[PDB]
Scaffold this motif. Structure first.
Motif, PDB file in Angstrom:
ATOM      1  N   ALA A 205       0.847  -1.182   0.000  1.00 22.57           N
ATOM      2  CA  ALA A 205       0.000   0.000   0.000  1.00 22.57           C
ATOM      3  C   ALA A 205       0.885   1.235   0.000  1.00 22.57           C
ATOM      4  CB  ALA A 205      -0.951   0.016   1.201  1.00 22.57           C
TER       5      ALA A 205
ATOM      6  N   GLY B 179       0.997   5.686   0.703  1.00 22.08           N
ATOM      7  CA  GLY B 179       0.376   6.762   1.450  1.00 22.08           C
ATOM      8  C   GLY B 179      -0.421   7.697   0.561  1.00 22.08           C
TER       9      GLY B 179
ATOM     10  N   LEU C 202      -3.282   5.888   5.138  1.00 15.90           N
ATOM     11  CA  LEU C 202      -3.377   4.791   4.186  1.00 15.90           C
ATOM     12  C   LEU C 202      -4.113   3.631   4.840  1.00 15.90           C
ATOM     13  CD1 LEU C 202      -0.114   2.713   3.607  1.00 15.90           C
ATOM     14  CD2 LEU C 202      -0.783   3.702   5.792  1.00 15.90           C
TER      15      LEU C 202
ATOM     16  N   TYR D 248      -5.379  -0.728   4.149  1.00 16.08           N
ATOM     17  CA  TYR D 248      -5.119  -1.953   3.407  1.00 16.08           C
ATOM     18  C   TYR D 248      -5.800  -3.116   4.112  1.00 16.08           C
ATOM     19  CZ  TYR D 248      -2.610  -6.187   2.030  1.00 16.08           C
ATOM     20  OH  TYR D 248      -2.289  -7.462   1.626  1.00 16.08           O
TER      21      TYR D 248
END
Lengths: 360, 189
Positions: A193, A195, A201, A203
Motif C-alpha cells: 500500500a 500513502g 493509508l 489496506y
C-alpha cells in the motif's frame, strides 16, 4: 473428519456452532470444553474466581465446579491423554467453548494463573467458524518516533493479521512540517500500500498468513522529528486496547568478579575470575507438565548458541568483546519453567585484551 | 498437628505437575482417592502465612483410615559413600594462588534400577571404561551421581576411570586424577 485448529490467548473464546476431543498442540495451555447453550459472556465469571484467589482459604476446585454449573449445563477438563456428549434435549444450535482452566504449575509456592497455548480440537459438512466475540475489536497503539539525522529510515514490524482484519495507519508532524513519506510493504519488502495526502493509508489482506512492515522515510536540513504515529486494526475511527507492534524481549543481566589472577604489562591483558547470570521471559519456550511429570527442564554443559540450534528457537547469545583465546567455563546450565521463564548461569576464567593501559 | 504454640499451619496436596488435587480441612486432615492408571502425589506444607521453632509431627498412610512400622511411603534419596586419598603435592603457585595435587577418588552407591539378569550375559559384572559418570548416564538413560571439583582450573588428567555394576544393583566408581585448584585464601604476610 476435518476437525479444527486454532490458537488461544490468555483469555478468549473459540466457538464452532453447527447449524444442523481436545488436545494440546504445544505450550502452557490446559484445555477446557464448554457446551452451554445461549452463549452471552462466559469469560466474565471466570475472572472473578481468579481475582481474590481463595484457594488457600478452602479450595479452588470446589469454587470452579460451582461457578461452572451456573454458566454451563455440561463440561469437562483436559489433563493427560484424555484424562477428563451433552444431552441434546431438543433441536437447536450447539455451542462449543474454550479458554483454558485455573491451575497451578509450580511447587515452590501456589500461584493460580491462566494458561496460553495452541490446541488441535478434534470435535461431510461440519466445519464452520461462528464466534460471538466482537469482530470490530481494535488494537490501537500510539508511540513517538525520532528521526532527525542519526537514523533517516525507520521501520517497524506488525504481528500477524487475519483475512477479516483491516489495517489503518496515521501520522502527522507537530511543527515545521517536511511532508514525510511513509510506505507499507510485506515482510519480504514487496510494497502493498502507498500513502495518500496527515498522511493516511488503508489496506485489507485476505491471505492465510499476512504480515506487515511499516516504513517511515525522511531522506527526501530539518529540526528534530516531532512526530506521533497512530496505527490500529479494525479501527476506522482512530485519531489503550492491545499492542499491535512487535516488542523485543527484555533481558536481566548481572556480573560479579571474584579474583584478579594476573596482569601482563607487555601484551596489555589481564585475567579475571567471576560469575555471570542472565534471565529472560519467553512464552514460546513454555511446555506442559503432563508430558514430563516435571516442573523445570535442563540443558547442562552447553552454551546458549548450542542449545538454540538443538531446539530451533532464537536465544540471547552473548560473547566477551575483548576475549583472547579460549575461556574455562564451569557449571553451565539453563533451566526453563512451564510459564516460559528461562535463566542462564556460568562461572568463567577469561583473559581480556586491554590496549588502554598507560604506564607512563 | 503442632505440639506447642499452634499457628494453624496450612497444608496442600497437589499432583506431580503442581495441579491441586485435595485441600486441607480443619489437627488438619485430608483424604483423596485416585483412579487413574498412574497416580503420583506431592504433599505441600506451608508456613508462610514470628514463630518459635516448628514442633510438628506429620502422619501419612495408604489404605489406613485409622492412623493416629509398616513400609515407607515417601521417596528416599540414595546414600553415597565417598573417599579421597592424596598421594603427592606437585607444586604451589604463590602469584596466581593455586596448587596442584595427585590422588585417588572412589564412590559407591546402591540402586536397584541398575540391576540385570546374568542369563542374558553369562557374566557377573558390567563394565564402562574410560567414561565419566555424566557420559555413562546419558548412554543408559538413568540418573547417576555426577560430581565436579569446585575450584578446578583448566582440564584435569583422569586415569583408570571405570564403573562396575553387579546384578543386585550395587555400583561403584574409581579414578586417579591430577588437578589444579584455585586457592584465593592464601596469606603470605
Amino acid at each position: 473428519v476435518q476437525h479444527f485448529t486454532g490458537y488461544i490467548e490468555d483469555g478468549r473464546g473459540i466457538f464452532y456452532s453447527l447449524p444442523d476431543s481436545m488436545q494440546n498442540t504445544g505450550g502452557n495451555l490446559d484445555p477446557l470444553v464448554g457446551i452451554m447453550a445461549e452463549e452471552i459472556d462466559p469469560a466474565v465469571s471466570l475472572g472473578q474466581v481468579l481475582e481474590k484467589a481463595l484457594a488457600s482459604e478452602n479450595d479452588l476446585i470446589s469454587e470452579l465446579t460451582a461457578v461452572a454449573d451456573r454458566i454451563f449445563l455440561g463440561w469437562d477438563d483436559d489433563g493427560g491423554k484424555g484424562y477428563s456428549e451433552f444431552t441434546i434435549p431438543r433441536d437447536g444450535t450447539y455451542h462449543i467453548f474454550a479458554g483454558s482452566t485455573i491451575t497451578n504449575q509450580r511447587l515452590d509456592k501456589f500461584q493460580p494463573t491462566y494458561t496460553t497455548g495452541s490446541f488441535q480440537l478434534i470435535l461431510e459438512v461440519f466445519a464452520s467458524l461462528a464466534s460471538l466475540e466482537i469482530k470490530p475489536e481494535a488494537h490501537v497503539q500510539e508511540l513517538e518516533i525520532r528521526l532527525d539525522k542519526d537514523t533517516r529510515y525507520l521501520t517497524q514490524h506488525t504481528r500477524n493479521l487475519q483475512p477479516g482484519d483491516t489495517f489503518h495507519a496515521l501520522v502527522e508532524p507537530i511543527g515545521e512540517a517536511p511532508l514525510p513519506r511513509l510506505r507499507l510493504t510485506d515482510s519480504g519488502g514487496k510494497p502493498l500500500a502507498f500513502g495518500l495526502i496527515s498522511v493516511e493509508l488503508n489496506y485489507t489482506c485476505d491471505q492465510d498468513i499476512c504480515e506487515l512492515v511499516v516504513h517511515v522515510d525522511g531522506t527526501d536540513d530539518s529540526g528534530e522529528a516531532v512526530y506521533r504515529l497512530l496505527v490500529g486494526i479494525n479501527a476506522p475511527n482512530l485519531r489503550v486496547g492491545s499492542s499491535v507492534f512487535l516488542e523485543s524481549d527484555l533481558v536481566t543481566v548481572g556480573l560479579a568478579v571474584d579474583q584478579i589472577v594476573g596482569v601482563d604489562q607487555r601484551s596489555e591483558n589481564f585475567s579475571v575470575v567471576g560469575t555471570l547470570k542472565l534471565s529472560w521471559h519467553d512464552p514460546k519456550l513454555g511446555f506442559s507438565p503432563d508430558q514430563c511429570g516435571c516442573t523445570v527442564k535442563s540443558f547442562e554443559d552447553a552454551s546458549i548458541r548450542a542449545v538454540a540450534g538443538e531446539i530451533n528457537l532464537p536465544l540471547p547469545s552473548f560473547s566477551f568483546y575483548n576475549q583472547q583465546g579460549n575461556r574455562w567455563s564451569q557449571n553451565q546450565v539453563i533451566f526453563v519453567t512451564p510459564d516460559g521463564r528461562a535463566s542462564y548461569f556460568e562461572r568463567f576464567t577469561v583473559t581480556l585484551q586491554a590496549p588502554d593501559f598507560d604506564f607512563l
